[PDB]
Design an enzyme around this catalytic site. Structure first.
Site, PDB file in Angstrom:
ATOM      1  N   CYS B  40      44.940  37.862  34.918  1.00  0.00           N
ATOM      2  CA  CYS B  40      44.080  38.676  35.759  1.00  0.00           C
ATOM      3  C   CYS B  40      43.784  38.131  37.143  1.00  0.00           C
ATOM      4  O   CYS B  40      43.471  38.925  38.061  1.00  0.00           O
ATOM      5  CB  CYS B  40      42.711  38.826  35.019  1.00  0.00           C
ATOM      6  N   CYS B  43      45.490  39.157  40.872  1.00  0.00           N
ATOM      7  CA  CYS B  43      45.027  40.323  41.589  1.00  0.00           C
ATOM      8  C   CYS B  43      43.523  40.318  41.838  1.00  0.00           C
ATOM      9  O   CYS B  43      43.056  40.858  42.843  1.00  0.00           O
ATOM     10  CB  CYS B  43      45.397  41.604  40.830  1.00  0.00           C
ATOM     11  N   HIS B  44      42.757  39.798  40.879  1.00  0.00           N
ATOM     12  CA  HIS B  44      41.313  39.844  40.961  1.00  0.00           C
ATOM     13  C   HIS B  44      40.671  38.620  41.559  1.00  0.00           C
ATOM     14  O   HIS B  44      39.475  38.666  41.904  1.00  0.00           O
ATOM     15  CB  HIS B  44      40.706  40.160  39.580  1.00  0.00           C
ATOM     16  N   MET B  81      46.627  48.980  38.297  1.00  0.00           N
ATOM     17  CA  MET B  81      45.947  48.215  37.240  1.00  0.00           C
ATOM     18  C   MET B  81      46.599  48.507  35.891  1.00  0.00           C
ATOM     19  O   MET B  81      46.518  49.629  35.400  1.00  0.00           O
ATOM     20  CB  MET B  81      44.465  48.551  37.219  1.00  0.00           C
ATOM     21  N   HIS B 320      51.761  36.455  54.399  1.00  0.00           N
ATOM     22  CA  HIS B 320      52.503  35.871  53.276  1.00  0.00           C
ATOM     23  C   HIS B 320      53.597  34.957  53.782  1.00  0.00           C
ATOM     24  O   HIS B 320      53.349  33.804  54.118  1.00  0.00           O
ATOM     25  CB  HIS B 320      53.018  36.968  52.351  1.00  0.00           C
ATOM     26  N   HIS B 363      58.874  41.943  53.184  1.00  0.00           N
ATOM     27  CA  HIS B 363      58.981  40.674  52.481  1.00  0.00           C
ATOM     28  C   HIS B 363      60.216  39.943  52.959  1.00  0.00           C
ATOM     29  O   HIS B 363      61.305  40.062  52.364  1.00  0.00           O
ATOM     30  CB  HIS B 363      59.040  40.913  50.956  1.00  0.00           C
TER      31      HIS B 363
HETATM   32  C1  DHE Z   1      53.518  31.560  49.365  1.00  0.00           C
HETATM   33  C2  DHE Z   1      54.971  31.839  48.889  1.00  0.00           C
HETATM   34  C3  DHE Z   1      56.115  31.545  49.505  1.00  0.00           C
HETATM   35  C4  DHE Z   1      56.337  30.760  50.830  1.00  0.00           C
HETATM   36  C5  DHE Z   1      56.691  29.272  50.587  1.00  0.00           C
HETATM   37  C6  DHE Z   1      56.829  28.369  51.745  1.00  0.00           C
HETATM   38  O1  DHE Z   1      56.557  28.770  52.898  1.00  0.00           O
HETATM   39  O2  DHE Z   1      57.193  27.162  51.506  1.00  0.00           O
HETATM   40  C7  DHE Z   1      57.200  32.014  48.671  1.00  0.00           C
HETATM   41  C8  DHE Z   1      58.551  31.831  48.895  1.00  0.00           C
HETATM   42  C9  DHE Z   1      59.524  31.961  47.909  1.00  0.00           C
HETATM   43  C10 DHE Z   1      60.920  31.574  48.049  1.00  0.00           C
HETATM   44  C11 DHE Z   1      61.489  31.036  49.360  1.00  0.00           C
HETATM   45  C12 DHE Z   1      62.803  31.576  49.825  1.00  0.00           C
HETATM   46  C13 DHE Z   1      63.277  31.126  51.172  1.00  0.00           C
HETATM   47  O3  DHE Z   1      64.468  31.313  51.425  1.00  0.00           O
HETATM   48  O4  DHE Z   1      62.409  30.601  51.947  1.00  0.00           O
HETATM   49  C14 DHE Z   1      61.511  31.773  46.870  1.00  0.00           C
HETATM   50  C15 DHE Z   1      62.999  31.547  46.486  1.00  0.00           C
HETATM   51  C16 DHE Z   1      60.525  32.283  45.949  1.00  0.00           C
HETATM   52  C17 DHE Z   1      60.774  32.711  44.658  1.00  0.00           C
HETATM   53  C18 DHE Z   1      59.953  33.576  43.977  1.00  0.00           C
HETATM   54  N1  DHE Z   1      58.676  33.957  44.375  1.00  0.00           N
HETATM   55 FE1  DHE Z   1      57.654  33.250  45.943  1.00  0.00          FE
HETATM   56  N2  DHE Z   1      55.998  34.101  45.225  1.00  0.00           N
HETATM   57  C19 DHE Z   1      54.709  33.821  45.646  1.00  0.00           C
HETATM   58  C20 DHE Z   1      54.397  33.030  46.740  1.00  0.00           C
HETATM   59  C21 DHE Z   1      55.277  32.497  47.655  1.00  0.00           C
HETATM   60  N3  DHE Z   1      56.660  32.587  47.532  1.00  0.00           N
HETATM   61  C22 DHE Z   1      53.783  34.561  44.835  1.00  0.00           C
HETATM   62  O5  DHE Z   1      52.265  34.462  45.002  1.00  0.00           O
HETATM   63  C23 DHE Z   1      54.511  35.392  44.059  1.00  0.00           C
HETATM   64  C24 DHE Z   1      54.220  36.740  44.761  1.00  0.00           C
HETATM   65  C25 DHE Z   1      54.104  35.399  42.628  1.00  0.00           C
HETATM   66  C26 DHE Z   1      53.956  34.250  42.051  1.00  0.00           C
HETATM   67  O6  DHE Z   1      53.222  34.137  41.005  1.00  0.00           O
HETATM   68  O7  DHE Z   1      54.487  33.168  42.450  1.00  0.00           O
HETATM   69  C27 DHE Z   1      55.907  35.004  44.200  1.00  0.00           C
HETATM   70  C28 DHE Z   1      56.979  35.466  43.449  1.00  0.00           C
HETATM   71  C29 DHE Z   1      58.248  34.913  43.484  1.00  0.00           C
HETATM   72  C30 DHE Z   1      59.315  35.147  42.510  1.00  0.00           C
HETATM   73  O8  DHE Z   1      59.154  36.105  41.330  1.00  0.00           O
HETATM   74  C31 DHE Z   1      60.218  34.163  42.683  1.00  0.00           C
HETATM   75  C32 DHE Z   1      61.510  34.998  42.918  1.00  0.00           C
HETATM   76  C33 DHE Z   1      60.387  33.163  41.596  1.00  0.00           C
HETATM   77  C34 DHE Z   1      59.259  32.577  41.199  1.00  0.00           C
HETATM   78  O9  DHE Z   1      59.229  31.423  40.711  1.00  0.00           O
HETATM   79  O10 DHE Z   1      58.123  33.150  41.275  1.00  0.00           O
HETATM   80  N4  DHE Z   1      59.327  32.421  46.633  1.00  0.00           N
HETATM   81  C1  HEC Z   2      47.495  43.359  39.463  1.00  0.00           C
HETATM   82  C2  HEC Z   2      48.620  44.111  39.229  1.00  0.00           C
HETATM   83  C3  HEC Z   2      46.391  43.449  38.356  1.00  0.00           C
HETATM   84  C4  HEC Z   2      46.293  42.726  37.244  1.00  0.00           C
HETATM   85  C5  HEC Z   2      47.267  41.685  36.658  1.00  0.00           C
HETATM   86  C6  HEC Z   2      45.061  43.128  36.581  1.00  0.00           C
HETATM   87  N1  HEC Z   2      44.411  44.062  37.362  1.00  0.00           N
HETATM   88 FE1  HEC Z   2      42.621  44.895  37.003  1.00  0.00          FE
HETATM   89  N2  HEC Z   2      42.789  46.018  38.643  1.00  0.00           N
HETATM   90  C7  HEC Z   2      43.818  45.975  39.578  1.00  0.00           C
HETATM   91  C8  HEC Z   2      43.570  46.959  40.606  1.00  0.00           C
HETATM   92  C9  HEC Z   2      44.513  47.184  41.811  1.00  0.00           C
HETATM   93  C10 HEC Z   2      42.436  47.593  40.304  1.00  0.00           C
HETATM   94  C11 HEC Z   2      41.707  48.706  41.082  1.00  0.00           C
HETATM   95  C12 HEC Z   2      41.296  49.977  40.365  1.00  0.00           C
HETATM   96  C13 HEC Z   2      42.306  51.097  40.382  1.00  0.00           C
HETATM   97  O1  HEC Z   2      41.885  52.269  40.519  1.00  0.00           O
HETATM   98  O2  HEC Z   2      43.509  50.748  40.246  1.00  0.00           O
HETATM   99  C14 HEC Z   2      41.946  47.033  39.059  1.00  0.00           C
HETATM  100  C15 HEC Z   2      40.782  47.411  38.421  1.00  0.00           C
HETATM  101  C16 HEC Z   2      40.243  46.783  37.323  1.00  0.00           C
HETATM  102  C17 HEC Z   2      38.968  47.109  36.711  1.00  0.00           C
HETATM  103  C18 HEC Z   2      38.060  48.254  37.214  1.00  0.00           C
HETATM  104  C19 HEC Z   2      37.102  47.906  38.358  1.00  0.00           C
HETATM  105  C20 HEC Z   2      36.516  49.072  39.102  1.00  0.00           C
HETATM  106  O3  HEC Z   2      36.887  50.222  38.764  1.00  0.00           O
HETATM  107  O4  HEC Z   2      35.688  48.795  40.016  1.00  0.00           O
HETATM  108  C21 HEC Z   2      38.770  46.257  35.707  1.00  0.00           C
HETATM  109  C22 HEC Z   2      37.581  46.150  34.731  1.00  0.00           C
HETATM  110  C23 HEC Z   2      39.906  45.349  35.676  1.00  0.00           C
HETATM  111  N3  HEC Z   2      40.807  45.720  36.652  1.00  0.00           N
HETATM  112  C24 HEC Z   2      40.093  44.329  34.775  1.00  0.00           C
HETATM  113  C25 HEC Z   2      41.238  43.580  34.635  1.00  0.00           C
HETATM  114  C26 HEC Z   2      41.470  42.584  33.615  1.00  0.00           C
HETATM  115  C27 HEC Z   2      40.428  42.189  32.549  1.00  0.00           C
HETATM  116  C28 HEC Z   2      42.715  42.130  33.787  1.00  0.00           C
HETATM  117  C29 HEC Z   2      43.454  41.036  32.945  1.00  0.00           C
HETATM  118  C30 HEC Z   2      43.813  41.515  31.665  1.00  0.00           C
HETATM  119  C31 HEC Z   2      43.297  42.809  34.904  1.00  0.00           C
HETATM  120  N4  HEC Z   2      42.371  43.692  35.433  1.00  0.00           N
HETATM  121  C32 HEC Z   2      44.567  42.593  35.411  1.00  0.00           C
HETATM  122  C33 HEC Z   2      44.914  45.138  39.501  1.00  0.00           C
HETATM  123  C34 HEC Z   2      45.210  44.263  38.480  1.00  0.00           C
END
Ligand code: DHE
Ligand code: HEC
Ligand code: DHE
Ligand code: HEC
Lengths: 544, 542
Positions: B40, B43-44, B81, B320, B363
């Site tokens: 959770c 996103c939260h 969500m 990002h 991206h």
């Molecule tokens: C902040 C960030 C950077 C910049 C790094 C830098 O400047 O040194 C980055 C770059 C990257 C780069 C850099 C590529 C390049 O050529 O610079 C790669 C290969 C990469 C592979 C992935 N990223 Fe990444 N990535 C995140 C965050 C980031 N990724 C996330 O918060 C996200 C959205 C989800 C997550 O939980 O991590 C996410 C999902 C992914 C993937 O699903 C990838 C494909 C595999 C993985 O382990 O999560 N991220």
């Molecule tokens: C990212 C993809 C998410 C993850 C993982 C979880 N949530 Fe989430 N949640 C997300 C969004 C973009 C929203 C907004 C509401 C909408 O209309 O889409 C929400 C909302 C909730 C809420 C409702 C809050 C409100 O209506 O003010 C609850 C109670 C909530 N989410 C709970 C929750 C929990 C317990 C999660 C882990 C299992 C979880 N969320 C994951 C996005 C994302």
């Protein structure tokens, strides 16, 4: 946990303590406090304890008191420890003691933040710039005016420096902490302890507040831009809570840039969630504000030439930064990390730390300090102390007196402990030192005066004359405290506040600097709890 | 959005429950806490203040009530969500645990300061004891450092023979590999905040130093200003919100900076501003730090860590990833949820432009620089939210009207793109479609011929390379991701990313012919994701 002479000048969060909070739930092993009980304890905590321990309880001068820590200690220990009482503030029952012990075992919530939306809602422009005068419209001698805080009345008095007539009494925020002047001397800024800022136009036929804004819940500092070319461009305010500073438009008070001071301690490099803003000064060498951040021990040089691409210099200094001043050349900032008995020196031209030195005294409290030319040592800045009777001198001339620069050159006794302010002026041969917080009425009601011309720096203790300021004021009731010398524009007369209670008789005493004799006693029914006094010219120019 | 599965392992105590709310036991609360961080918090927010998902702090959740929370968690909503209950991801009992958990006041997340960093800091081979010259026969500049995500390892692979030279154990799910400016030292950062430093000059290269810089981290970079080679490394964390500058030879933590602060636009305090991409300036001795939630780009001068000079640039929220233009002067970064590219001048230390790409959720990775035949120097990005590729002019002096303007936008394979790539020696622009729901698209790459671009407003054609099919992998759902070139820019590598218990591969494409060159397969090649060529990474050639 006992009252010292140097542990009374700690923040009291009485405006923030007026906010009601919700009672939290209690984990296993801890008993919950009711709504009333929790709020009663919270009000006590914010007023008497948060200064040293923090509203979040992460510790300041006193150690952290977070739930994890206090639950290991236990109720009994807390109860017993709190039974003694706490150090007094500026001049608990059995039920209250238990409330505090229980409160400490519960999880604290963080008070509300105060951001741009909140500031802008509080922001009122009474007289827009276009509707203000384009030249001075009253016949006052503005540069020789004194702006005097009437603490408990939530007002200031504007008093003629030569005739001693009260020209006007203006409504402001509660307990204004300081007055500051724009670089041109036109605009007067005041900040209340509650974070309320008033901006007053001294050119109006009847000077009044032209704009106001609230910048926080608890605040103590404000300053104006003093770099050549940037006159009247900006004002800056600093808050205890939330931990932030705000750069405002110098003409309207529009809030332009808010910066959080939450961050890492300079030494142990650990996150601190409550780094209060202490003194704020303005550089004369660069277009920068100089901001002391207390609990993290950082001095910030904030460049106001571009608020969107914001350049700052975060200088690692010493923890517990409070007040300070510029040297005579206006190049070096000399500030007290009070709890650590140190004077930090920053070079505002180069943007770097130059020295850190222990004064040899307990809890240095300079105000802006006192710059003078010592007959033997050359240019020096001086500070007195809250914790002892000592006056310390530091050399301030690296070019002309390199062997003396940034070294503590002498230390000698004045009237007694509890001193707050030291004062001199370029036209005076005298160094004035108060003893405001001394427990002895006769000491707290007098001022020590040293003859700079007679100083030799031979290691002996310079003699001083004792001016019986409170006696001169002729106040028979209570034990009024004498506080803070401030000179007139010409540096021929020095004013002191004779600070008594709100329903008691106070006064201002004006001393003729050349003779050290009484010049005048200012009394008026409107002069309630007079504290800080700021001469327009000496404040606009940083002449001290 | 991120997954903070490292904070979930922390065991916490059950908080109290105020009047009108039930308390959860220690076990129930801990079970809920783990779920909260694992599924959770991305996103939260760790602090439940809200990031992409709404705020879930107790003041708000109690007004909504248990039933509302239970229902939303069970069924979700069309606005991003997930339907945790009806999908089966969470049991009915776990759904209720989460609803109850959200009504309670959270125990503050652990900080991670200098004491904690120093305790985790290990120097396996002191600098004095390391080689004084390369003691292997490897061609280091043509070496590829490849993440084996789920195995908590990286693979050092020869750029010409395709031989897996060594498989090294690192932090879990290494996010990126970065090289020192001399090309000697290889830095990797795990999602867990674990940093490993590897000495490529050793007979058998291995970790010479390691440190942990936070609970959740994604970024690391090295000092790239001339004269500052090998001096510093910097790591950025999602939690706590902070960055740390470390000694480039030992990893000693030197300066930790919090990123908690005010949002640039509404100027409101934000308690969890995650550090995203970190780059290194070639014009000043500075690090370039993206701070996501507050929309600030920090220029941090490392010449003096005690009297610390920074420039805090107001940009746009949701910063990002990004890259430098071809001249290495301008930093172009995606403020992704707002569909903007932000351009900073690293020489003058100021914002120069903010432009909408016309696409959904740009991206770029580090993006793709090339000289467009009619537009001049441009930088390209693809998008996660649509199939578009956008080009921005990067030459204010030489093509003034085109500078910092979107000059063209055209479709590639489909939505779900992550990385776009080119090289100065190539005439081709490669675009992946990793997150697309269709297997044929997710396992393929689009290739545009830069030489054929006319910028006449028409959409340029592309060739489709069937990368996953070339690898001989259909099992599970292999997603192809990220082009990376060799040192000479004559071959391009793609990862065929399949599940941990499935077969993955790396596919090497001949850039001149656009044909399959070589397939890298190995039982050790578990979940291959990011690939970084030593020379192209150390020199910021992209
Ligand atoms: C902040 C960030 C950077 C910049 C790094 C830098 O400047 O040194 C980055 C770059 C990257 C780069 C850099 C590529 C390049 O050529 O610079 C790669 C290969 C990469 C592979 C992935 N990223 Fe990444 N990535 C995140 C965050 C980031 N990724 C996330 O918060 C996200 C959205 C989800 C997550 O939980 O991590 C996410 C999902 C992914 C993937 O699903 C990838 C494909 C595999 C993985 O382990 O999560 N991220
Ligand atoms: C990212 C993809 C998410 C993850 C993982 C979880 N949530 Fe989430 N949640 C997300 C969004 C973009 C929203 C907004 C509401 C909408 O209309 O889409 C929400 C909302 C909730 C809420 C409702 C809050 C409100 O209506 O003010 C609850 C109670 C909530 N989410 C709970 C929750 C929990 C317990 C999660 C882990 C299992 C979880 N969320 C994951 C996005 C994302
Ligand atoms: C941060 C700070 C400054 C520097 C301001 C700047 O640079 O613009 C300052 C300066 C000051 C100055 C500046 C004098 C100068 O010449 O610059 C004065 C007169 C002053 C009168 C008092 N101060 Fe002050 N003062 C505090 C804080 C501060 N005081 C406190 O936290 C404290 C200890 C208690 C509180 O809760 O406010 C405290 C009690 C007092 C007093 O009891 C005083 C004497 C009376 C009063 O009116 O409230 N403080
Ligand atoms: C500043 C002068 C203080 C005020 C006002 C209060 N406290 Fe304090 N406290 C202070 C100090 C200097 C110390 C000693 C430890 C240190 O930081 O050097 C303490 C200690 C406590 C303790 C003991 C905790 C322990 O670990 O032993 C408690 C429980 C405590 N203080 C509580 C407390 C309360 C409830 C106060 C309001 C009345 C209060 N303190 C005021 C400094 C100061």
């Amino acid at each position: 946990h006992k009252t010292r002479t140097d542990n009374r000048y700690e923040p009291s969060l009485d405006n923030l303590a007026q906010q009601d909070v919700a009672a939290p739930g209690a984990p296993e092993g801890v008993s919950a406090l009711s709504d009333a009980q929790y709020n009663e304890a919270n009000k006590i905590y914010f007023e008497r304890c948060a200064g040293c321990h923090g509203v979040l309880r992460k510790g300041a001068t006193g150690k952290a008191l977070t739930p994890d820590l206090t639950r290991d200690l236990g109720f009994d220990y807390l109860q017993s420890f709190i039974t003694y009482g706490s150090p007094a503030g500026m001049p608990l029952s059995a039920e209250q003691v238990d409330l505090m012990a229980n409160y400490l075992l519960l999880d604290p919530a963080a008070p509300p933040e105060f951001g741009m939306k909140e500031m802008r809602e509080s922001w009122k422009v009474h007289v827009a710039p276009e509707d203000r005068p384009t030249q001075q419209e009253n016949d006052w001698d503005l540069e020789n005016l004194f702006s005097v805080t009437l603490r408990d009345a939530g007002q200031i008095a504007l008093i003629d420096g030569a005739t001693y007539e009260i020209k006007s009494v203006l409504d402001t925020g509660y307990a204004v902490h300081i007055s500051r002047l724009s670089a041109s001397g036109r605009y007067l800024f005041v900040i209340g302890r509650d974070g309320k800022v008033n901006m007053i136009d001294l050119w109006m036929k009847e000077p009044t507040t032209v704009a106001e804004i609230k910048i926080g819940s608890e605040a103590r500092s404000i300053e104006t831009s003093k770099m050549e070319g940037w006159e009247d461009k900006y004002a800056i305010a600093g808050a205890y809570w939330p931990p932030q500073y705000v750069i405002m438009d110098g003409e309207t008070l529009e809030p332009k840039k808010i910066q959080s001071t939450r961050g890492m301690t300079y030494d142990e490099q650990e996150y601190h969630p409550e780094p209060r803003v202490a003194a704020i000064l303005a550089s004369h060498y660069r277009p920068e504000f100089i901001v002391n951040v207390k609990e993290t021990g950082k001095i910030l040089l904030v460049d106001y030439t571009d608020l969107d691409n914001l350049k700052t210099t975060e200088i690692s200094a010493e923890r517990f930064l409070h007040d300070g001043g510029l040297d005579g050349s206006h190049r070096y900032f000399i500030t007290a990390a009070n709890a650590r008995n140190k004077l930090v020196v920053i070079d505002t031209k180069e943007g770097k730390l130059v020295a850190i030195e222990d004064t040899g005294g307990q809890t240095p409290h300079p105000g802006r300090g006192a710059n003078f030319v010592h007959p033997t040592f050359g240019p020096v800045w001086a500070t007195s102390h809250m914790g002892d009777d000592s006056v310390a001198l530091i050399g301030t001339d690296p070019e002309g007196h390199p062997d003396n620069a940034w070294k503590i050159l002498d230390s000698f006794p004045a009237l007694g402990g509890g001193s707050l302010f030291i004062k001199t002026h370029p036209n005076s041969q005298y160094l004035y030192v108060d003893a405001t917080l001394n427990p002895e009425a006769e000491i707290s009601g007098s001022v020590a005066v040293f003859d700079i011309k007679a100083m030799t720096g031979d290691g002996s203790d310079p003699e001083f004359k004792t001016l019986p300021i409170a006696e001169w004021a002729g106040i028979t009731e209570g034990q009024p405290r004498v506080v803070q010398g401030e000179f007139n524009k010409d540096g021929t007369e020095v004013w002191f506040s004779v600070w008594n209670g709100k329903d008691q008789e106070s006064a201002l005493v004006v001393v003729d600097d050349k003779t050290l004799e009484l010049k005048h006693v200012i009394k008026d029914e409107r002069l309630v709890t007079p504290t800080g006094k700021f001469n327009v010219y000496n404040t606009m120019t940083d002449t001290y």
